[PDB]
């Protein structure tokens with residue numbers, strides 16, 4: 220069997236807390252009334268919801284209404300309890316209300332509105348300083364939720380709302396988030412393909428908060444190198460091969476051996492042999508103004524196969540890459 224693993228930080232935060240904090244199945248959800256909200260327009264969609272801009276008619280304030288689609292009721296209770304636990308945390312989206320549609324029996328979550336700036340319009344305008352600034356804001360949200368015993372497990376650009384004009388950043392979409400319990404074996408079918416950590420791809424179930432630090436590394440690589448996504452897998456198996464084409468196959472076997480992971484033998488047919496690439500090889504004329512020795516050193520410390528070797532969110536905040544913020 221595989222070697223057990225635990226987070227290096229905030230390991231026993233849920234162990235020392237009462238049942239009410241982490242037992243989301245037992246949590247009493249009090250559903251408000253939808254009549255306080257008038258829907259304005261569709262803002263987005265996801266594999267799990269339909270998201271609308273709305274107005275709260277009791278204070279003329281804009282809100283966001285996330286109407287939840289057919290899914291396990293256990294999953295909705297989990298998302299509600301985590302949002303309630305993290306409510307008020309730095310750069311965490313604020314859950315304002317929970318309402319139901321009497322007729323169709325459909326639950327909806329009501330959030331604070333974020334005036335999200337478009338990514339395609341943002342990319343070219345983003346400077347080295349702006350990347351450092353926003354990366355730091357995400358770290359504040361991750362250090363906070365990890366300190367609260369929660370793993371986000373779906374860190375990606377689509378789940379980060381930025382109101383560039385107000386330099387306001389919010390980490391959203393807590394639908395895949397989970398309570399960290401040391402030694403727990405989690406479902407590896409989480410995160411979005413390009414952002415999945417090697418632990419998920421090799422089916423190592425005892426992962427932790429460090430999964431979020433890998434995803435953050437993928438976002439940083441994509442921003443500084445202007446290559447979106449950075450690891451462009453066409454499926455979950457190919458995703459590991461794309462990582463192996465950068466980090467090399469030697470360190471992948473060291474990781475598998477350290478945790479006694481039973482690697483699916485089909486991988487030995489597609490992985491091949493790949494040398495470890497230097498991060499400097501991703502520097503080109505279009506991205507050199509965003510790359511620096513500090514940026515490459517910070518990225519190298521997040522994008523590691525070994526989930527225990529990655530920087531924690533607090534260690535990342537102390538990195539020289541952030542001295543200017």
Ligand SMILES: O=P(O)(O)O[C@H]1[C@H](OP(=O)(O)O)[C@@H](OP(=O)(O)O)[C@H](OP(=O)(O)O)[C@@H](OP(=O)(O)O)[C@H]1OP(=O)(O)O
Nearest residue numbers: 444445446447448449450451452453454457461464503505
């Ligand atoms: O980053 P770009 O210069 O835009 O090039 C990428 C990249 O190709 P290179 O890595 O060879 O530059 C992708 O290839 P992979 O990294 O995925 O192997 C490819 O994606 P597909 O292979 O899925 O086509 C993508 O094409 P697309 O824009 O259709 O995603 C293509 O972009 P360009 O064609 O714009 O260069």
Ligand SMILES: Nc1ncnc2c1ncn2[C@@H]1O[C@H](COP(=O)(O)OP(=O)(O)O)[C@@H](O)[C@H]1O
Nearest residue numbers: 263264265266267268270283330332333392394
């Ligand atoms: N608070 C928000 N402010 C503005 N837009 C948001 C907000 N929350 C969600 N959105 C939009 O709705 C989309 C879907 O968000 P989300 O429902 O949380 O994820 P999913 O359905 O994929 O689990 C986002 O990608 C974004 O475009």
Ligand SMILES: NCc1ccc(-c2ccoc2)c(Cl)c1
Nearest residue numbers: 233234235236241400401403
């Ligand atoms: N079903 C997941 C789960 C929930 C709670 C705990 C717990 C917390 C404190 O003592 C045991 C553990 Cl270890 C696992």
Ligand SMILES: NCc1ccc(-c2ccoc2)c(Cl)c1
Nearest residue numbers: 253254256257320325326327
């Ligand atoms: N007052 C109009 C209206 C109508 C329906 C909804 C709804 C929320 C969740 O499901 C439906 C909401 Cl939020 C508002």
Ligand SMILES: NCc1ccc(-c2ccoc2)c(Cl)c1
Nearest residue numbers: 338350353354376379380442
């Ligand atoms: N909502 C799309 C989007 C766009 C840009 C970033 C970014 C930029 C620099 O650091 C993070 C992020 Cl996190 C998300």
Ligand SMILES: [Mg+2]
Nearest residue numbers: 265377378392
């Ligand atoms: Mg989403």
Ligand SMILES: [Mg+2]
Nearest residue numbers: 285391392393
């Ligand atoms: Mg959300």
